[PDB]
Amino acid sequence: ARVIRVVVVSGSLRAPSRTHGLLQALVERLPAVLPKLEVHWVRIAELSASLAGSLERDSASADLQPHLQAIEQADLLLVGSPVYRASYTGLFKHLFDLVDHQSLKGVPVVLAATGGSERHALMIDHQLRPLFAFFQAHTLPYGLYASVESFDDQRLADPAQFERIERVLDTVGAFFHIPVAR
Numbered sequence: 668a669r670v671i672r673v674v675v676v677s678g679s680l681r682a683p684s685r686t687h688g689l690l691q692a693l694v695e696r697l698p699a700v701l702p703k704l705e706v707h708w709v710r711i712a713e714l715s716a717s718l719a720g721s722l723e724r725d726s727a728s729a730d731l732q733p734h735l736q737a738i739e740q741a742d743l744l745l746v747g748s749p750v751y752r753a754s755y756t757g758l759f760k761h762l763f764d765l766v767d768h769q770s771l772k773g774v775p776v777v778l779a780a781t782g783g784s785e786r787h788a789l790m791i792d793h794q795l796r797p798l799f800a801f802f803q804a805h806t807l808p809y810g811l812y813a814s815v816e817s818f819d820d821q822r823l824a825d826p827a828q829f830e831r832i833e834r835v836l837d838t839v840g841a842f843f844h845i846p847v848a849r
């Protein structure tokens with residue numbers, strides 16, 4: 668079996684964050700569907716310095732290069748952003764403005780977001796999904812959207828979200844043709 672390279676992009680501007688907690692909950696259950704995997708994180712909240720210094724892919728700062736390569740070489744991408752101005756954060760977007768635009772074609776992508784309100788639940792399908800559709804990535808059908816009520820501080824605490832995570836993982840296992848049994 669091939670080790671599946673999983674890269675997790677957390678778009679929060681600050682740490683700790685509910686978006687991070689949502690991504691952790693997903694990541695924690697990932698080994699139940701993938702027999703071999705390496706999981707790596709790209710956390711915007713720690714990259715503001717490297718991000719500012721990077722205006723083109725080929726000229727990106729040496730310290731951002733590892734994060735870009737990881738995304739560009741991932742077998743599976745999990746992405747999450749809190750909702751800002753009814754979309755993902757601009758710094759999360761700046762990251763993807765640098766990511767090679769041929770590199771994600773056909774790559775499975777899980778979309779996730781956290782918001783202050785349910786009113787922006789459509790950000791998943793009208794903002795995050797189109798972003799990854801530009802890359803022609805294989806966005807997976809079930810996106811995660813959790814508003815503030817789903818969390819205890821920054822930890823996911825909502826049984827309905829834990830269940831939807833399991834449905835996401837069903838689709839991850841199916842995509843990698845992992846013989847369906849857990």
Ligand code: NA
Pocket residue numbers: 738739740741770771772774
């Ligand atoms: Na790739």
